[PDB]
Each structure stands twice: as structure tokens, then as C-alpha cells.
Design an enzyme around this catalytic site. Structure first.
Site, short mmCIF file in Angstrom:
data_model
loop_
_atom_site.label_atom_id
_atom_site.label_comp_id
_atom_site.label_asym_id
_atom_site.label_seq_id
_atom_site.Cartn_x
_atom_site.Cartn_y
_atom_site.Cartn_z
N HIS A 61 0.99 -1.04 0.05
CA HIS A 61 -0.17 -0.39 -0.36
C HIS A 61 1.20 1.19 -0.03
O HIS A 61 1.56 2.01 0.60
CB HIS A 61 -0.76 -0.19 1.19
CG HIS A 61 -2.27 1.18 1.58
ND1 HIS A 61 -3.45 1.58 0.29
CD2 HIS A 61 -1.95 1.59 2.31
CE1 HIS A 61 -3.35 2.06 0.63
NE2 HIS A 61 -2.82 2.51 1.75
N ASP A 63 1.16 5.56 -0.26
CA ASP A 63 0.17 6.02 -0.05
C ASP A 63 1.50 7.79 -0.89
O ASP A 63 2.85 7.97 -0.67
CB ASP A 63 0.24 6.86 1.10
CG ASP A 63 -0.79 6.29 1.70
OD1 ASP A 63 -1.91 5.58 1.68
OD2 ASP A 63 -0.16 5.39 2.72
N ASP A 175 -8.27 1.33 1.83
CA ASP A 175 -8.21 1.73 2.81
C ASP A 175 -8.78 3.73 2.32
O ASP A 175 -8.55 4.65 3.88
CB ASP A 175 -6.32 3.01 2.66
CG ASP A 175 -6.18 3.26 4.35
OD1 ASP A 175 -6.02 2.85 5.08
OD2 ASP A 175 -4.80 3.84 4.39
N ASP A 312 1.53 -1.51 4.06
CA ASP A 312 2.17 0.20 4.23
C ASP A 312 3.42 -0.02 3.53
O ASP A 312 4.18 -0.60 4.59
CB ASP A 312 2.02 1.36 5.25
CG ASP A 312 0.38 1.44 5.45
OD1 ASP A 312 -0.26 0.76 5.03
OD2 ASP A 312 0.55 2.25 6.40
N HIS A 442 -6.61 9.71 -0.52
CA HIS A 442 -7.59 9.54 0.69
C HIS A 442 -6.50 10.33 2.36
O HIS A 442 -7.39 10.11 2.78
CB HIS A 442 -8.25 7.74 1.07
CG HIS A 442 -6.54 7.09 1.01
ND1 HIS A 442 -6.39 6.57 -0.28
CD2 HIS A 442 -5.63 6.39 2.06
CE1 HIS A 442 -5.12 5.98 0.49
NE2 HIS A 442 -4.98 5.66 1.54
#
Ligand SMILES: CC(C)(C)c1ccc(C(=O)C[C@@H]2CC[C@@H](O)[C@@H]3[C@H](O)[C@H](O)CN23)cc1
Ligand SMILES: *[C@@H]1O[C@H](CO)[C@@H](O)[C@H](O)[C@H]1NC(C)=O
Ligand SMILES: [Zn+2]
EC number: 3.2.1.114
Length: 1016
Positions: A61, A63, A175, A312, A442
């Protein structure tokens, strides 16, 4: 013909509003599965003739900004993850990996040498590396507008088609903080077949798991037939991490995250570590793991099981790839060779899982339930409801909506022509689309990133706004100059944009004054653009250096105008008052502009020595004790003063509004004879708890109902004009303004929470409408969903996203509040509406951010307030889960989100100027929009292609006769059409070759895309 979206209540197995009404939401200790129960299974269910097929799906994951910026994470983490994925997948043909965030993938791929680009294409082509969703980001689903969700999806998928030759049909959303049906709506119209979600309320997971309803056909709330349905898989447990993805017991699953043995600086909080798999332990380890898998499998209907393997920024180091792969390979070799387990386990991808599920379905082994509704408001545990991020960082939430509109207007204005590469049009538009797309993340629009990351997003959006301005102003100069005179310098500023509401009065001094004078310049051309596909009138205003200014159209016809002062509000630290000051050298001129569909209109402003025949001047009244003088230079009307008092105003034939002595609305009278309906604005504050869990960027955990803001004796300014009137008041933390132009009022709040720690400021409307426990809020600016207040849930659970509007109604009366920015809100009692303005929180709320929210800055929030009689409207029945706007409310929303654009000519004389563009464009029915117009080809393409997204909303029938409008055929908007095709919403697949090159209009609540091809 078209489905009726009003009168037929869909029959579905699970309807989320009905489920909410029935559920008890008890938070009991379920054992090792803390929010579930002790799962039991029959060991005899699987056998030689019926095996459990297990797909372990490695993931990471990533971001695009959160605790670090996009570029910081790329340099420190993501580039290493992707480099090592390429090496490890190349070298290990049975290993698999999924990837979601195309912003990162594009950043990486373009820096690769050709040899490695080819290796990368090969592991994608052979199915080892699989893209899931394929958007630029994994977007927020609460605050995001549907137009920007589509924009970012299109940006990622267009890149993937061009460079990787693939288009994902399975979506992965692990998420975002709660889930919206706007996602399956867009995905199903973009070729998708399957989607996966994770963050739904723990009580919802338990309820659906008990009924094996975690996989369902998710259709829209109004969809009677089911044509919108998309197969959806909801994950069952608390997290997407390895401890919460193997099965119900995280103390067991954590032992199968082989990164947690110590050398990587990670451990298991349940206090049992992983152990390397060996020949001496593999039987016992397999016993434990298969037992977890068979328990998880009990929650679903087929013999195919999904086991995500990731967390993550995982799969970063070579040693990590090795430790996960080799240990799982030893487990698979043992399990698959031991007949007594009746399991076949392997690494897989997301598409491989869904393909196997549907094979099982087609074999008649399972049938799936139908579902409609949404998954807000999320709670991950106890009373921790994630309604705070509906408001956090509201300056950037407002900025999102401004940039949304600028991207649309820049793409539309420049689409009319083909441009030379030297003009840099494609370059600037690609930058603007990518920065706006990034912010849909997000941790972007949600307001949940660290301070320096928020600053990075802001800087990126400012560069995007500048790019849009450049493209828009070059386009206007080309569209409105005689072709044989047009002589562009593609670096020059022919026009500057004037925007009255961003950053806004009292936020930034950003607007240019038009400088006129007998000894400098007698007149100035201005131009308005209307991105909507119908004729539109709207008041527009400009700053000018004299009050003696007249307006003409380009046939030299006089246009009625009003001049008002320029008023600015100041917190006077000497007198300790908040009060307005007027300019003695700058004035506002206001007039009604009339602009063609998707068109332009030119006007001229001219100075004179004295009051012009067709310009009037507003009166001004300052209400306060202890007034002092307020000089206004040449302005012809002296300011008047008085003690605070109630007042009433009416512009044109519109409503009459009454205000309290504190400058706040108290009633609305729709017509001359009609009642004065009580409608009261009030400001209140929520606090933070002194014991237990604290509010932060994510969580709203109030210390009880809100308390009224103490107002003192505030200063009230009343401006009364023929075209525009207003009442403005300086309240603690808010300059509140009600503006009247002859229809529903506009509300503006300049919100400066200052140093008020642990405070959330709310704006409430109090009415006597008998709404009971029902209210309506929108989802992504696309649809209105019925809400029911539930007193069995805490206050914060009754807060919902307000991405564009909300309303309450009874049998006779409705009050609708439209917004120019996404914020959080509710109806906490019959007859009320409320919407949060800003929040300043000193504490972290334990979701990883590691800071409070203490970086507030002044923001100008905008609204329209529409009071209407609805007794004659054809509304859905009591059991229908949707609601619909009236014509007036829809037009009011469009006035906020897609206003006219204003351009000021930058030089002294515009040689070759023309008066109008688009007078021959069709004026489409009011419920239809051209949401996107985008040229898809560069100038070297022999066959030019232009893409259109067409959206029809659904408006209530309330007895207003329909006047004939014109049919809009987007395929004939540009000349020399050779082909018209219906496409997916991303423009990437042709679905229908259209007869006679005509693009049909769409049905209510439907969205379609068309591409026209032209000989060039
Ligand atoms: C260790 C502790 C501080 C208690 C914690 C707790 C929960 C989370 C998340 O739910 C995952 C979070 C949810 C919020 C969201 O902003 C973040 C980022 O998007 C990141 O991908 C992980 N996400 C993370 C850490
Ligand atoms: C792209 O994918 C299609 C479908 O598999 C294939 O026919 C085509 O040759 C591919 N294009 C390439 C490899 O350039
Ligand atoms: Zn995340």
C-alpha cells in the site's frame, strides 16, 4: 425507454438504510476475532472431489503523500519497492504482485532504461505483475466530486493503455475511510467487472458475515432493473494488514508475516513471533494456517478464498521479498501434497481470484445477494466514528472545487481548436489534470496529511490553477479575434482571470482593479465564459478605479449596472471590535451577463465625468453603538449609521428576508401575500473530551451537544441596491454574509478560527419543518441519499459527508442548503440542518498521523439557501432510499460549482475583437450537462478526436410547464464529423458505432461518453 428513478422502489436483498434501522450495533467482545464470534467449520466440507482453492495475493500500500510528500516517499521507499519487484518477479516466475497507484508507477517507469522497460512490460504481459483499479490514486470516497474521481481514473488508465497495453477490470480500495456507491457507478460504466472494499463499520462486517453477504451485486439506490450492478467483495476483518487477512485470529496470522522476526525492526503485538518454516515445523505451522483459512472461508459462499499478503510500503528490500516468498513456498509445498487438508494454495492476483469465483458461480455452486446503499459513517472500533475528516483542512477542500471547475473550463475552451505544439496546451493541461488527480488521494482532500505535505498539495494545486488560466486566456483570445488579425505570442497574457470567490475577500488580495481615467484609458473589454450547455444569465462584478462607470454590450447597447463600495473587515486589536472599512479609490461594478451555451460574451466598461444614465448606486447602513465616520472618496451616496435593529430586505420580485439585530437570518417570505417562514441561522461550538479518546484529523469525538457562540454586540453592515443587496456581520471567528440578487440567497462565511484550540465551529439552521428523523445528503455531487438520525448511535455517527448539498422536508415545505465545498453535517433534531465550518484540534487521534490540526487558515465558504413549497411535487414513496432536487436547487448548485468565468483584457486596445462565441450552440434541457469536453488528439493526427461525458440528473416534477429546448448532439458540435462512437467513460474502449453520426441524449441519472472523429 428510460427507467423511472422516482416511482419504483427496487427489490434488493440488503438495503443499507433498512439494515441500519434493524441492527443493534452492540460492541461485544467476540474472542480472538474481537468484533466477530468464534468461527466453527465442518472438517468434512472439503474433500478429494471438493477442494478449497486459496489465492495468496502479495501487495504494497503506497500513499501518494501522507507523513512524507509524494516525492519524499518516491525517493525513500517506492522507487526501491518497484525496482526490487521487477528483479524478484523476473527471477521467480511463480511469484505475483498487484499494484494500485499509477501516479507512482508512471514516475518510476519514465526513469527506467529501455532494457528494464522491456522487462517490466514482459512481467505485466505474462500476468505476474497486475494493475488493480489503475487510477492515478486510491481516492477518498466521501469528499471527492464524481467528476474528479472519473478524472483521476482516466489519467491512470490512459497511461496504462499507452505504455503497458492493459486496462484493469478489477478494483482494489483497501484504505478509504468508508465507501460510496459512486465508485461502482463510475467503474461499471468504465468496463469493470469486479471491485473490492475494506473500511466498513465493524457492526456491518459482523452482520453481513453471519449471513454470508460479504460478496454482493452492488446496484444504485434507484435502480429497479439492476443494470448498474457490480460484483463487490467486502473484506471481513479490522485491517488489510497480514495479522487481519489470514483468518479471524491475529495472534496466529501475525506469525505468518515473515518480516516480523526482528531484523527489520518489526514485531507482533500479540507477543508470539513468526518462525522460519523448516521440515521439522512445517506440519504444525500448516495445521495452524489452514485452520485460519478454513475459518475465513466459512464467511463466503464459494470454494475459492482470497488471502491478501501486504501492508504499507511493503516489499522494499530484497531480503524481504526472499523471506516472504521462501517461507510461503515451503508452506504451499507441504499443504498441497497433504491430501487430508483438501487445499490447493498458490500465489495469485486479484483478477485470478475473481475469475475463479465466477467460474464457481457459473457451475451453480453459489448465488449472490443484491445490495444498495452506502458505507458511511465508518467506525473501526467502539465509538470512534470517522466523521472529522469530512471537515479537516477546509481551505484545501474548497480549493479542490475551484480547481475542478478550472480544469473543466480549460479543457473545454481549448478543445474547440487544434493547437501547435509550441503553444504548450497539452503540456499545461496534463500538469493541471495530474495535480488535481493527485489531491483525490485518501490523505489529500481528506485533510489527513502532515502540515508540510498539505503545503506540497497546495503548491501543486496553485501551479495547476496557473496552468488552467494560461490555457483559458490563450483560448479566449483565439475564439474572439478576427482570424486574419489573430497574432499569438503563446507566452503572453492577453487576459487575466477575475474570481470573486477564490481565494476570496479577506483571504487574499488577489484581484486586479480595472484602471480607467481621462488621462490614461477611457474603457476596458471584459469577457465571460459559460461552461454549461444552456443560455445563462448571472450577475458578475469587477473592481474599477472610479464609481462613474457604464456598461455596454458589443453592439453598444447599454446594460443596467450597480456600483457598490469595496468593503473589507478588520479585527481591530486596539478597539477589540470586528468592523468594516471602505475603499476611497476602488469600487465594485455589478451587471447581468448573458452568455451562450458553452460560449463567450464580450462587454465594455467606460468611464465618465459624472453619474451615468444606466448605473445606480447602493445605499449603505452601518449598525453599531459608538459609530465613527466612513468616507468613500467619489462614491455619490454617504454611508448612514444607526443602533442595532431588526431589518428586512427584498431584491426584485424575489423573497423578502428578515434579520435579527445581530445580522442573522430569522425568516423568509416567498411572495407578497405569503407567511414569514421561520428560518434562523445560529453559530455554535463543539469541544473535545477531557478524558478518554480525543478528536483529531480523522475522528469527531465531541464533549456533548454544541454550545452557542457568545456574540456580544456585533457590527452589522447593510448594503441595499437595485441589482444586489446584502447583510454582513463580524462575529467571533466568522464574517457571515447573506447576499440577495432576486432568487434564493447566497451565504458566504469568512472563517478564521484563529488560536481557538480544541474547538469545532458549526453553522446551524433552525426551522419548524416537521422532518422528524429524516434528512438527505449527497454522495460525490452525483445523487441524494436518504438518511435517518439514529438515537441508538452517538452524535458523531449521525454526521455524514456534505459534498455538495443537504435538505430536510415535510409534506409541504423543503429547505435545501447547497455548498461550494465538501464539509461534514447532520440534522440532529427535527427541523434542523447543520454544517461544520472548521476544526482546530491539539491532539493526535491514534491513526498514524502523529499530529493534531493546528495549521488553520482563513477560508471563504460559499452556499445557496433554497426554501420551497413541495406539496405539489411528485416525490418518491416513503420506502424509496433516494431523494431528488428541484430545478431551483439544481441551478443554485451549478451557480456555486460552475459559475461564469471572467476575463479582463490586459492591454490598452484589443485589435480585431469580437462580441460573442457559441450563439449557434444548442441550448439543452436544464437537467443535462456536458461534464467533460476534451480533445483527445494532438495536431499531427490526420483524424481529430474529441471526447464528451454527458450526465443527466433527475429533477422533481412540481407543476412548472416545460418549454421546448433544443436536442444536444455532441457529435455535431465540431464541423466535418466522420464518425461518432459511444465509449467507456475513460474514452478507452469503443462500445457502439452510432447511426448517422448522432450521439443520443442520456436517461435521467445516467452518464454516457461519446467520441466524435473529424477530417482535419
Ligand atoms: C499504529 C497506529 C498509530 C495505532 C495506527 C492505527 C491505525 C492505522 C490505520 O488504520 C491505517 C491508516 C488509516 C488512516 C490513513 O490516513 C493512513 C494512510 O493512508 C496509510 O496508508 C495508513 N492509513 C495506522 C496506524
Ligand atoms: C496489446 O494487447 C492485445 C490483446 O492481448 C494484443 O493483441 C496486442 O498485440 C497487444 N499489443 C502489443 C503487444 O503491442
Ligand atoms: Zn493509505
Amino acid at each position: 425507454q428510460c427507467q423511472d428513478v422516482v416511482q419504483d422502489v427496487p427489490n434488493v436483498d440488503v438495503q443499507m438504510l433498512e439494515l441500519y434501522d434493524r441492527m443493534s450495533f452492540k460492541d461485544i467482545d467476540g474472542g480472538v476475532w474481537k468484533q466477530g464470534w468464534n468461527i466453527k467449520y465442518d472438517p468434512l466440507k472439503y474433500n478429494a472431489h471438493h477442494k478449497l482453492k486459496v489465492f495468496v495475493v502479495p501487495h504494497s500500500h503506497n500513499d501518494p503523500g501522507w507523513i512524507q510528500t509524494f516525492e519524499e516517499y518516491y525517493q525513500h521507499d517506492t522507487k526501491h519497492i518497484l525496482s526490487n519487484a521487477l528483479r524478484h518477479l523476473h527471477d521467480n516466475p511463480e511469484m505475483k504482485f498487484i499494484w494500485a497507484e499509477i501516479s507512482y508507477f508512471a514516475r518510476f517507469y519514465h526513469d527506467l532504461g529501455e532494457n528494464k522497460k522491456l522487462q517490466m512490460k514482459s512481467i505485466v504481459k505474462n500476468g505476474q505483475l497486475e494493475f488493480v483499479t489503475g487510477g492515478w490514486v486510491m481516492p477518498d470516497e466521501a469528499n471527492s466530486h464524481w467528476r474528479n474521481v472519473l478524472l483521476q481514473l482516466t489519467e491512470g488508465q490512459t497511461w496504462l493503455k499507452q505504455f503497458m497495453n492493459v486496462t484493469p477490470t478489477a478494483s482494489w480500495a483497501i484504505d478509504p475511510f468508508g465507501h460510496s456507491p459512486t465508485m461502482p457507478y463510475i467503474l461499471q460504466k468504465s468496463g469493470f467487472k469486479n471491485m473490492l472494499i475494506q473500511r466498513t463499520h465493524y457492526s456491518v462486517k459482523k452482520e453481513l458475515a453471519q449471513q454470508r453477504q460479504l460478496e454482493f451485486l452492488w446496484r444504485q439506490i434507484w435502480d429497479n432493473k439492476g443494470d448498474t450492478a457490480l460484483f463487490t467483495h467486502m473484506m471481513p476483518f479490522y485491517s488489510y494488514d497480514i495479522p487481519h487477512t489470514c483468518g479471524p485470529d491475529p495472534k496466529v496470522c501475525c506469525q505468518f508475516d515473515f518480516k516480523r522476526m526482528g531484523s527489520f525492526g518489526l514485531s507482533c503485538p500479540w507477543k508470539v513471533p513468526p518462525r522460519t518454516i523448516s521440515d521439522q515445523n512445517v506440519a504444525a505451522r500448516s495445521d495452524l494456517l489452514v485452520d485460519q483459512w478454513k475459518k475465513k472461508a466459512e464467511l463466503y459462499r464459494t470454494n475459492v478464498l482470497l488471502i491478501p499478503l501486504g501492508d504499507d510500503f511493503r516489499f522494499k528490500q530484497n531480503t524481504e521479498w526472499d523471506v516472504q516468498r521462501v517461507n510461503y513456498e515451503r508452506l504451499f509445498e507441504h499443504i498441497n501434497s497433504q491430501a487430508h487438508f483438501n487445499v490447493q494454495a498458490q500465489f495469485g492476483t486479484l483478477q485470478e481470484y475473481f475469475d475463479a469465483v465466477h467460474q464457481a458461480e457459473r457451475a451453480g455452486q453459489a448465488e449472490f445477494p443484491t445490495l444498495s446503499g452506502d458505507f458511511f459513517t465508518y467506525a473501526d472500533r467502539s465509538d470512534n466514528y470517522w466523521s472529522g475528516y469530512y471537515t479537516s483542512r477546509p481551505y484545501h477542500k474548497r480549493m479542490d472545487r475551484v480547481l475542478m471547475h478550472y480544469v473543466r473550463a480549460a479543457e473545454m475552451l481549448s478543445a474547440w481548436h487544434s493547437w501547435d505544439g509550441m503553444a504548450r496546451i497539452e503540456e499545461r493541461l496534463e500538469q493541471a489534470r495530474r495535480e488535481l488527480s493527485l489531491f483525490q488521494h485518501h490523505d489529500g482532500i481528506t485533510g489527513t496529511a502532515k502540515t508540510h505535505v498539505v503545503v506540497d498539495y497546495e503548491q501543486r494545486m496553485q501551479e495547476a490553477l496557473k496552468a488552467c488560466q494560461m490555457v483559458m486566456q490563450q483560448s479566449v483570445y483565439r475564439l474572439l479575434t478576427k482570424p486574419s488579425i489573430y497574432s499569438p505570442d503563446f507566452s503572453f497574457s492577453y487576459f487575466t482571470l477575475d474570481d470573486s470567490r477564490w481565494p476570496g475577500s479577506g483571504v487574499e488580495d488577489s484581484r486586479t482593479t480595472i484602471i480607467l481615467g481621462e488621462d490614461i484609458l477611457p474603457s476596458k473589454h471584459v469577457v465571460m465564459h459559460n461552461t454549461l450547455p444552456h443560455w445563462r444569465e448571472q450577475l458578475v462584478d469587477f473592481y474599477v478605479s472610479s464609481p462613474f462607470v457604464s456598461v455596454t454590450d458589443l453592439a453598444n447597447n447599454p446594460v443596467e449596472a450597480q456600483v457598490s463600495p469595496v468593503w473589507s473587515w478588520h479585527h481591530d486589536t486596539l478597539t477589540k471590535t470586528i468592523h468594516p472599512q471602505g475603499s476611497t479609490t476602488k469600487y465594485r461594478i455589478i451587471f447581468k451577463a448573458r452568455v451562450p451555451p458553452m460560449g463567450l460574451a464580450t462587454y465594455v466598461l467606460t468611464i465618465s465625468d459624472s453619474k451615468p444614465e444606466h448605473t445606480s448606486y447602493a445605499s449603505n447602513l452601518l449598525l453599531r453603538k459608538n459609530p465613527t465616520s466612513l468616507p468613500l472618496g467619489q462614491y455619490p451616496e454617504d454611508v448612514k449609521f444607526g443602533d442595532p435593529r431588526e431589518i428586512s430586505l427584498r431584491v426584485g420580485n424575489g423573497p423578502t428576508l428578515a434579520f435579527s439585530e445581530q445580522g442573522l437570518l430569522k425568516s423568509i417570505q416567498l411572495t407578497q401575500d405569503s407567511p414569514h417562514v421561520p428560518v434562523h441561522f445560529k453559530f455554535l461550538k463543539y469541544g473535545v473530551r477531557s478524558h478518554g479518546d480525543r478528536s483529531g484529523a480523522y475522528l469527531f469525538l465531541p464533549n456533548g451537544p454544541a454550545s452557542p457562540v457568545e456574540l456580544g454586540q456585533p457590527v452589522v453592515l447593510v448594503t441595499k441596491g437595485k441589482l444586489e443587496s446584502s447583510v454582513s456581520v463580524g462575529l467571533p471567528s466568522v464574517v457571515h454574509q447573506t447576499i440577495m440578487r432576486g432568487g434564493a440567497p447566497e451565504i458566504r462565511n469568512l472563517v478564521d478560527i484563529g488560536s481557538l484550540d480544541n474547538t469545532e465551529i458549526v453553522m446551524r439552521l433552525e426551522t419548524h419543518i416537521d422532518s422528524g428523523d429524516i434528512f438527505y445528503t449527497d454522495l460525490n455531487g452525483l445523487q441524494f441519499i436518504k438518511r435517518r438520525r439514529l438515537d441508538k448511535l452517538p452524535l458523531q455517527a449521525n454526521y455524514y459527508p456534505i459534498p455538495s448539498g443537504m435538505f430536510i422536508e415535510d409534506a409541504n415545505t423543503r429547505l435545501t442548503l447547497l455548498t461550494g465545498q465538501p464539509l461534514g453535517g447532520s440534522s440532529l433534531a427535527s427541523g434542523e440542518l447543520e454544517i461544520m465550518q472548521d476544526r482546530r484540534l491539539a491532539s493526535d487521534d491514534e491513526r498514524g498521523l502523529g499530529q493534531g490540526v493546528l495549521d488553520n487558515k482563513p477560508v471563504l465558504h460559499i452556499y445557496r439557501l433554497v426554501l420551497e413549497k413541495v406539496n405539489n411535487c411528485v416525490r418518491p414513496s416513503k420506502l424509496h432510499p433516494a431523494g431528488y432536487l428541484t430545478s431551483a436547487a439544481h441551478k443554485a448548485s451549478q451557480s456555486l460549482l460552475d459559475p461564469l468565468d471572467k476575463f479582463i483584457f490586459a492591454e490598452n486596445e484589443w485589435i480585431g475583437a469580437q462580441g460573442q462565441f457559441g450563439g449557434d450552440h444548442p441550448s439543452a434541457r436544464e437537467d443535462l450537462d456536458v461534464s467533460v469536453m476534451r480533445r483527445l488528439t494532438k495536431s499531427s493526427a490526420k483524424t481529430q478526436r474529441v471526447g464528451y461525458v454527458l450526465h443527466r440528473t433527475n429533477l422533481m416534477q412540481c407543476g412548472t410547464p416545460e418549454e421546448h429546448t433544443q436536442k444536444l448532439d455532441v457529435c455535431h458540435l465540431l464541423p466535418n464529423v466522420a464518425r461518432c462512437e459511444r465509449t467507456t467513460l475513460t474514452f478507452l474502449q469503443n462500445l457502439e458505432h452510432l447511426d448517422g453520426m448522432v450521439a443520443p441524449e442520456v436517461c435521467p441519472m445516467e452518464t454516457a461518453a461519446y467520441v466524435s472523429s473529424h477530417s482535419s
